[PDB]
Design a protein around this ligand. Sequence first.
Ligand SMILES: Nc1ncnc2c1ncn2[C@@H]1O[C@H](COP(=O)(O)OP(=O)(O)O)[C@@H](O)[C@H]1O
Lengths: 424, 52
Amino acid sequence: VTRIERIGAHSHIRGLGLDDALEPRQASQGMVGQLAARRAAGVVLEMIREGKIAGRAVLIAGQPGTGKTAIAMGMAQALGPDTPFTAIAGSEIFSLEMSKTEALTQAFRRSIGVRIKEETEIIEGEVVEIQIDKVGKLTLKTTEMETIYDLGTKMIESLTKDKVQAGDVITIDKATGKISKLGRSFTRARDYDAMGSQTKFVQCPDGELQKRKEVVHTVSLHEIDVINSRTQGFLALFSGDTGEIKSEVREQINAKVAEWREEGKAEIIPGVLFIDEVHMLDIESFSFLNRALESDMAPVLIMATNRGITRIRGTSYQSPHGIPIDLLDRLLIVSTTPYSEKDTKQILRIRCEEEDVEMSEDAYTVLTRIGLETSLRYAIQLITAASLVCRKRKGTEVQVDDIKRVYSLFLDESRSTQYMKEYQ
Amino acid sequence: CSRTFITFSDDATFEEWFPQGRPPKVPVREVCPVTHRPALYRDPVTDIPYAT
Ligand SMILES: Nc1ncnc2c1ncn2[C@@H]1O[C@H](COP(=O)(O)OP(=O)(O)O)[C@@H](O)[C@H]1O
């Protein structure tokens, strides 16, 4: 059976391969080599799990194919679903309905988790009879007890607007919303022809009628969208408002979350914001981050740029990493070193093990020698390519000849630029 | 000075409003003969105010 998330580029990264003392192992769970960069990743991951401070930023820099996104995915996988890890690209902010600043604001607020716990007394039971004359009575039922309730004006109005019939397992809370939870217990045989799209006959509840329902759910600090309109939950599934007013975003929601945390009804859990390829950001977003990192409850940023001394978009000034120095000053730069003949073959072997490709030692050697001359991801793709070419060859073990067949079939950037002599 | 002298005294329907209810509270703890606890609901089949 095939799942939605089959093996991809970084599927082999099943967490960050460190020790109890953050010491990087040579061969570990997915990650390989890059000892210093991986130890720095573990340090920032511990700083994350701590969450005592805000406004931290680490920038992983290195040549393309050194494992920046690999370390990012390792940190993401090591940071369980408990805390949010919002991984956005460097171009997911250039929106048409949102400005280049509200996008970063929403991304920040999305990386701050909040575990809400709610308690409520609930009445649940099968409705036996509803008499009405206005005032009336209601006979709820459960295998443990059967009761009587006198209904008031609002109760009767809600009951009539919900059209609850006999046998329906009604559910009533204080400050009655009157959730018609389940369908009918009895009065079956409607399946003879049809059932309502909302009918879920499942049997009548057991146990006591009244109960205390404690419900815990993890939301994000972006819940301002859940207030920014009349029907708010709807705007949470699509683009939504162009931008929620600051006069509410930055004061009202924050104060209410503080009150919740003081009363003990909720608790904030900061997360991580991984902005990949941040070199595309304009100087405006960088000047915004300059102050955003100064705020009180900002998440920790993880940037991954592969550009050296290059021009900053929107301007003509060259700078390291292609971003402003006033922003680089507030970061913490880690460096990833290029892989060697020893590490390239190791990660290639791990990638072969991923899809369970049995490769010979000569094939491993030749593929490593190829990838050390052209590119790493090129040799990674050659793994699956040769695997398929040999599976069609009625083979079981990929060999040097099948690897060279693919090497000749599929070109790389270098050989393609070389063969581009015709100039159409 | 400025005063108000609303009048409806030509009929008794007005004069009947003030003494409308003037009734006190007489829902009391409906102790049940099972546990002697804050009785919760009257059983529609036994008409007894049971708690547990
Ligand atoms: N240290 C490592 N451990 C495991 N796999 C690695 C490692 N370094 C590179 N790889 C493999 O090489 C591939 C390319 O690395 P990638 O993360 O794309 O580099 P970059 O981060 O520079 O874009 C990844 O998909 C990964 O599977």
